[PDB]
Amino acid sequence: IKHPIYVIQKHDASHLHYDLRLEMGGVLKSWAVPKGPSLDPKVKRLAMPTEDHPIGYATFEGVIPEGQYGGGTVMVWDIGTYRNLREEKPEGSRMTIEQSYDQGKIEVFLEGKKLKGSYALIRTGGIEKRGWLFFKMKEPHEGSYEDIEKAAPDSVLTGRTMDEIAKEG
Ligand SMILES: [Mg+2]
């Protein structure tokens, strides 16, 4: 519905993992994030690049046959839009989202229902599976951080659990 799309799908495949996707250059650039996003700016999550997906896949919630790529249950875990923070810079520090991605340094403000705030995706040269680091960007906070995966486990589109999606198709 709104653009540029940000979506995370929770994906019960071989193992449970999250797929993060951001719209750019007409597709959803995608990463698999084994343990999902963290709200804590000290937590580094690893983000393994996966295939580009079509824009309309952002609201796919249902079941892919076991044995296929993407096989298992897919939940639309969070969805919204994002803003590219790297456009908010003095002249000659500005970077479009595509230039950001090409450089291996993406800083965005995610406008989701579960995640809302500044997050970084940083490309690495030597983490296994062409790893990137995915983390909440540092800002003032007092207190411990919610475990968003525990606190908000269900579909942002339908409110269903993973097992309800698997049973219903
Ligand atoms: Mg997958």
Author numbering: 30 to 198
Paste lines from the article:
The AP–NHEJ repair complex is primarily composed of a Ku homodimer, DNA ligase (Lig), DNA polymerase (Pol) and a phosphoesterase (PE). Studies on NHEJ repair in Mtu and the archaeon Methanocella paludicola (Mpa) demonstrated that both species possess equivalent core AP–NHEJ components, with orthologous proteins possessing near identical substrate specificities. We discovered that Pol has DNA strand displacement activity during RNA synthesis and that PE resects excessive incorporation to promote efficient break ligation. In this current study, we sought to extend our understanding of AP–NHEJ by comparing crystal structures of the archaeal (Mpa) Pol and PE with those of the established bacterial (M. tuberculosis and P. aeruginosa) DSB repair complexes.
We previously reported that the M. paludicola phosphoesterase (Mpa PE), which is operonic with an NHEJ RNA/DNA primase–polymerase and ligase, is a functional component of the archaeal NHEJ repair apparatus. To understand more about the molecular mechanism of these atypical nucleases, we elucidated the crystal structure of Mpa PE at a resolution of 1.79 Å. A ribbon diagram of the PE protein shows a hydrophobic core formed of a β-barrel super secondary structure, composed of nine anti-parallel strands. The β-barrel is surrounded by four α-helices and a 310 helix, as observed in a prokaryotic PE structure. The exterior of the β-barrel provides a cavity for the active site, which is enclosed by the 310 helix and a surface loop. A surface representation of Mpa PE is shown in Figure 1B and C, in which vanadate and magnesium ions can be observed occupying a cleft. Since vanadate is a structural analogue for phosphate, we infer that the vanadate ion is occupying the position of the scissile phosphate, positioned in between the six key catalytic residues: H40, H46, D48, R50, H82 and Y86. We predict that this cleft is a DNA binding channel. Analysis of the crystal structure of Mpa PE suggested that the conserved histidine residue (H82) may be one of the key residues in positioning the scissile phosphate in the active site.
